[PDB]
Design an enzyme around this catalytic site. Structure first.
Site, PDB file in Angstrom:
ATOM      1  N   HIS A   1     -11.373  -0.326   3.685  1.00 32.49           N
ATOM      2  CA  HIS A   1     -11.200  -1.781   3.667  1.00 32.49           C
ATOM      3  C   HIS A   1     -11.107  -2.225   2.214  1.00 32.49           C
ATOM      4  O   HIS A   1     -11.773  -1.650   1.360  1.00 32.49           O
ATOM      5  CB  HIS A   1     -12.414  -2.421   4.355  1.00 32.49           C
ATOM      6  CG  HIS A   1     -12.597  -3.878   4.064  1.00 32.49           C
ATOM      7  ND1 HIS A   1     -11.726  -4.850   4.510  1.00 32.49           N
ATOM      8  CD2 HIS A   1     -13.572  -4.528   3.384  1.00 32.49           C
ATOM      9  CE1 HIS A   1     -12.159  -6.036   4.118  1.00 32.49           C
ATOM     10  NE2 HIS A   1     -13.279  -5.869   3.436  1.00 32.49           N
ATOM     11  N   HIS A   2     -10.290  -3.233   1.923  1.00 24.37           N
ATOM     12  CA  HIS A   2     -10.260  -3.789   0.567  1.00 24.37           C
ATOM     13  C   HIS A   2     -11.084  -5.070   0.486  1.00 24.37           C
ATOM     14  O   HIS A   2     -10.810  -6.049   1.185  1.00 24.37           O
ATOM     15  CB  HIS A   2      -8.811  -4.064   0.111  1.00 24.37           C
ATOM     16  CG  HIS A   2      -7.997  -2.825  -0.084  1.00 24.37           C
ATOM     17  ND1 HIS A   2      -7.286  -2.230   0.936  1.00 24.37           N
ATOM     18  CD2 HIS A   2      -7.852  -2.018  -1.162  1.00 24.37           C
ATOM     19  CE1 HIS A   2      -6.744  -1.108   0.497  1.00 24.37           C
ATOM     20  NE2 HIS A   2      -7.073  -0.955  -0.773  1.00 24.37           N
TER      21      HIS A   2
ATOM     22  N   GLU B   1     -12.707   3.397   8.680  1.00 25.33           N
ATOM     23  CA  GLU B   1     -11.528   2.765   8.099  1.00 25.33           C
ATOM     24  C   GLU B   1     -11.852   2.316   6.685  1.00 25.33           C
ATOM     25  O   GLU B   1     -12.952   1.822   6.411  1.00 25.33           O
ATOM     26  CB  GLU B   1     -11.105   1.555   8.945  1.00 25.33           C
ATOM     27  CG  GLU B   1     -10.761   1.938  10.391  1.00 25.33           C
ATOM     28  CD  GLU B   1     -10.395   0.762  11.290  1.00 25.33           C
ATOM     29  OE1 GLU B   1     -10.440  -0.405  10.844  1.00 25.33           O
ATOM     30  OE2 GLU B   1     -10.065   1.018  12.472  1.00 25.33           O
TER      31      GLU B   1
ATOM     32  N   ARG C   1      -9.387   2.753  18.102  1.00 24.52           N
ATOM     33  CA  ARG C   1      -9.879   2.870  16.730  1.00 24.52           C
ATOM     34  C   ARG C   1     -11.274   3.493  16.770  1.00 24.52           C
ATOM     35  O   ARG C   1     -12.256   2.823  17.083  1.00 24.52           O
ATOM     36  CB  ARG C   1      -9.902   1.484  16.061  1.00 24.52           C
ATOM     37  CG  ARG C   1      -8.505   0.892  15.901  1.00 24.52           C
ATOM     38  CD  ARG C   1      -8.511  -0.600  15.614  1.00 24.52           C
ATOM     39  NE  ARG C   1      -9.000  -0.938  14.280  1.00 24.52           N
ATOM     40  CZ  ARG C   1      -8.875  -2.146  13.735  1.00 24.52           C
ATOM     41  NH1 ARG C   1      -8.281  -3.123  14.412  1.00 24.52           N
ATOM     42  NH2 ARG C   1      -9.335  -2.378  12.516  1.00 24.52           N
TER      43      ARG C   1
ATOM     44  N   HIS D   1     -15.048  -3.581  10.614  1.00 26.11           N
ATOM     45  CA  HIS D   1     -13.841  -3.947   9.891  1.00 26.11           C
ATOM     46  C   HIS D   1     -13.177  -5.153  10.548  1.00 26.11           C
ATOM     47  O   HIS D   1     -12.798  -6.109   9.876  1.00 26.11           O
ATOM     48  CB  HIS D   1     -12.850  -2.789   9.857  1.00 26.11           C
ATOM     49  CG  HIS D   1     -11.789  -2.952   8.817  1.00 26.11           C
ATOM     50  ND1 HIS D   1     -10.672  -2.148   8.759  1.00 26.11           N
ATOM     51  CD2 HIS D   1     -11.687  -3.817   7.781  1.00 26.11           C
ATOM     52  CE1 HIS D   1      -9.928  -2.510   7.729  1.00 26.11           C
ATOM     53  NE2 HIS D   1     -10.521  -3.521   7.118  1.00 26.11           N
TER      54      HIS D   1
ATOM     55  N   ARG E   1       0.806  -1.209   0.000  1.00 24.19           N
ATOM     56  CA  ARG E   1       0.000   0.000   0.000  1.00 24.19           C
ATOM     57  C   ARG E   1       0.844   1.266   0.000  1.00 24.19           C
ATOM     58  O   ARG E   1       0.307   2.363  -0.073  1.00 24.19           O
ATOM     59  CB  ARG E   1      -0.966   0.006   1.186  1.00 24.19           C
ATOM     60  CG  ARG E   1      -0.321  -0.030   2.549  1.00 24.19           C
ATOM     61  CD  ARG E   1      -1.358  -0.465   3.575  1.00 24.19           C
ATOM     62  NE  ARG E   1      -2.017  -1.693   3.138  1.00 24.19           N
ATOM     63  CZ  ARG E   1      -3.025  -2.278   3.776  1.00 24.19           C
ATOM     64  NH1 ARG E   1      -3.504  -1.747   4.895  1.00 24.19           N
ATOM     65  NH2 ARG E   1      -3.559  -3.392   3.295  1.00 24.19           N
TER      66      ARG E   1
ATOM     67  N   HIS F   1     -12.854  -9.184   8.775  1.00 23.78           N
ATOM     68  CA  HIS F   1     -11.635  -9.971   8.652  1.00 23.78           C
ATOM     69  C   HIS F   1     -11.711 -11.165   9.593  1.00 23.78           C
ATOM     70  O   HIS F   1     -10.904 -12.095   9.503  1.00 23.78           O
ATOM     71  CB  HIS F   1     -10.419  -9.100   8.972  1.00 23.78           C
ATOM     72  CG  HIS F   1     -10.034  -8.175   7.856  1.00 23.78           C
ATOM     73  ND1 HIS F   1      -9.291  -8.591   6.771  1.00 23.78           N
ATOM     74  CD2 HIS F   1     -10.317  -6.868   7.640  1.00 23.78           C
ATOM     75  CE1 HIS F   1      -9.134  -7.578   5.934  1.00 23.78           C
ATOM     76  NE2 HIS F   1      -9.748  -6.522   6.438  1.00 23.78           N
TER      77      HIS F   1
HETATM   78 ZN   LIG Z   1     -10.016  -4.710   5.530  1.00 25.37          ZN
END
Ligand SMILES: [Zn+2]
Lengths: 131, 83
Positions: free
Chosen positions: A101-102, A99, A95, A126, A4, A130
């Site tokens: 996220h991909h 956010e 947090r 998020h 990234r 995951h």
């Molecule tokens: Zn993510």
């Protein structure tokens, strides 16, 4: 040291969103990048994903159709290119902001800067996505 | 000067809240840490929602937020600001 942190140009179309855009970030696969935002970022080059991220929130700050769903203090945050704060119940400790996220993992060859592969998530969602 | 709200004069706390509401930091990280500190200082159930997701009819200007904190702590058995 991270994929990234390699330069790239933003691509992709995004999707229509409404006033529940950021509310949607706490659900399912996360919320899409708004088509309006994608229009403005496409073909700009960013030196890293973090710079792209700053650009997303700066564009949110400049689009009244999206910024009207942020209060004064969150407007201040996005004016600096900072991610806005999510509601307390969507935060996880330190947090506290939305956010990016991909959807397809970068580890599996998912695109870093294709906005059709990006979602907006709350910290809570998020982490849950995951798993 | 960092450990609890009785370490802040009302004016000093207003400075903190004003800084947050203006996002008057040079990094996102700093701002988030300030907000975490805010939530810990007030001990209010709403946490950062006092700043970003006000109840209906609550004033989310810096002074409005400080007043909401001051009144809540006063009404719920907690100590107040220094001085
Ligand atoms: Zn993510």
């Amino acid at each position: 040291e991270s994929k990234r942190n390699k330069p790239g140009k933003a691509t992709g179309k995004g999707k229509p969103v409404g006033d529940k855009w950021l509310d949607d970030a706490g659900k399912d696969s996360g919320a899409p990048i708004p088509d309006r935002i994608a229009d403005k970022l496409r073909d700009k080059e960013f030196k890293s994903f973090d710079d792209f991220r700053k650009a997303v929130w700066e564009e949110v700050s400049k689009d009244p159709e999206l910024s009207k769903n942020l209060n004064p203090s969150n407007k201040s945050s996005v004016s600096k290119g900072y991610s806005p704060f999510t509601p307390k119940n969507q935060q996880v400790g330190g947090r506290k902001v939305y956010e990016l996220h991909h959807d397809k993992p970068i580890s599996q060859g998912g695109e870093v800067y294709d906005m059709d592969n990006i979602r907006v998530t709350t910290p809570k969602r998020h982490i849950d996505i995951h798993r | 000067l960092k450990h609890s709200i009785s370490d802040y004069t009302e004016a000093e706390f207003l400075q903190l809240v004003t800084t947050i509401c203006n996002a008057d930091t040079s990094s996102e990280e700093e701002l988030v840490k300030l907000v975490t500190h805010f939530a810990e200082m007030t001990e209010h159930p709403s946490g950062s929602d006092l700043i970003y997701y006000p109840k209906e009819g609550d004033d989310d200007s810096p002074s409005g937020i400080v007043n909401t904190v001051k009144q809540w702590r006063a009404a719920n058995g907690k100590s107040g600001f220094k001085q």
